[PDB]
């Protein structure tokens, strides 16, 4: 069942991986409305597709900034992987294309906003609320990992809540197709596994660490390791002593000690039983994994939505003109985009 599912999931993925989609829209097919969010470099805008009238989220990447930050390969990774995957909690890439100055990835617009904003506004999530989101990340990582994909940037800022209150994972910027180990220092400081930090080489178990960080932060309202600067955070991660809010249930604490486990022979996700050590953990005992995949569970929270194009679940951002030069920049570098 899971085996037949993942197997055919894999054949579908490989066909798209081997022959990616290219150039399925162009800039003037869309009206740009408002910025939805921004990252290290580059921004996401709410746009309206002229001919269909549908709204989308358009991620704009300046090729020159990509090159300068040395993210060419990661950007090619991002698009090649996002156009090939298919899972109920992964955001859909609807179009991609490039022009003289920029790379564009047009996704389904997920109007409920970032988990981040809700989390900070509300304070923290009760354990059943946190568990419901966590479950979706567990299933998503089972899917991804099965394709030899590592995700590498789990955090509430890259998690979107859809109109049904379910999660949509976005930002495949550091996603990578790798069998065995890899070495890139990347992710977000609060979420980095200690082996990433220690320059050891690392594998997919870093996504299970990050899940532990996510679950903690969701339930606590603050991360397990915080400080004012990254370097202080790394220190605390490397120590690995973790302390839990007084309100955490015994089950939750036990799960987190097994995810935020500095020892890879003992971290959940990374063992002989694989994801089942997580799915069968006591904290998830009330979770109907089939029902979650099927999206039949009642969400704990359903965002307010006032008609298409509403951005009220998102912060406001400074807008700025998207330039497009008359000279092609970095054409060769991004040919396969």
């Amino acid at each position: 069942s899971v085996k037949e599912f993942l197997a055919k999931a894999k054949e579908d993925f490989l066909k798209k991986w081997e022959t990616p989609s290219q150039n399925t829209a162009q800039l003037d097919q869309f009206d740009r409305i408002k910025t939805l969010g921004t990252g290290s470099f580059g921004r996401v805008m709410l746009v309206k597709h002229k001919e269909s009238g549908n709204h989308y989220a358009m991620k704009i990447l300046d090729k020159q900034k990509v090159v300068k930050l040395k993210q060419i390969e990661h950007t090619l990774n991002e698009k090649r992987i996002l156009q090939a995957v298919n899972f109920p909690f992964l955001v859909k890439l609807e179009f991609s294309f490039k022009d003289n100055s920029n790379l564009y990835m047009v996704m389904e617009y997920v109007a409920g906003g970032e988990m981040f904003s809700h989390l900070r506004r509300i304070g923290r999530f009760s354990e059943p609320h946190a568990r419901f989101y966590a479950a979706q990340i567990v299933l998503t990582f089972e899917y991804l990992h099965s394709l030899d994909l590592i995700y590498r940037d789990l955090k509430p800022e890259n998690l979107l809540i859809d109109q049904q209150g379910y999660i949509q994972v976005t930002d495949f910027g550091f996603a990578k197709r790798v069998k065995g180990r890899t070495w890139t220092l990347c992710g977000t400081p609060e979420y980095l596994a200690p082996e990433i930090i220690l320059s050891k080489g690392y594998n997919k178990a870093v996504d299970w660490w990050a899940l532990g960080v996510l679950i903690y932060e969701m339930a606590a309202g603050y991360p397990p390791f915080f400080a004012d600067q990254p370097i202080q955070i790394y220190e605390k991660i490397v120590s690995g002593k973790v302390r839990f809010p007084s309100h955490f249930s015994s089950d939750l604490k036990d799960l987190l000690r097994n995810l935020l486990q500095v020892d890879l022979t003992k971290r959940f996700g990374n063992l002989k039983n694989g994801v089942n050590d997580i799915k069968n953990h006591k904290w998830f005992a009330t979770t109907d994994w089939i029902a979650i995949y099927q999206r039949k569970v009642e969400a704990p929270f359903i965002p307010k939505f006032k008609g298409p194009g509403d951005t009220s679940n998102f912060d406001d951002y400074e807008e700025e003109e998207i330039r497009v030069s008359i000279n092609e920049k970095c054409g060769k570098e991004f040919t396969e985009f």
Binding site: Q71, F116, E157, F174, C186, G187, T188, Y222
Partner: peptide, 20 residues
């Protein structure tokens, strides 16, 4: 409290990815 210390810290807003 831990909460109070986090909230007074400078990383309570959206966090940027690193690629150090």
């Amino acid at each position: 409290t831990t909460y109070a210390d986090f909230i007074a810290s400078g990383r309570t807003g959206r966090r940027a990815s690193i690629h150090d």
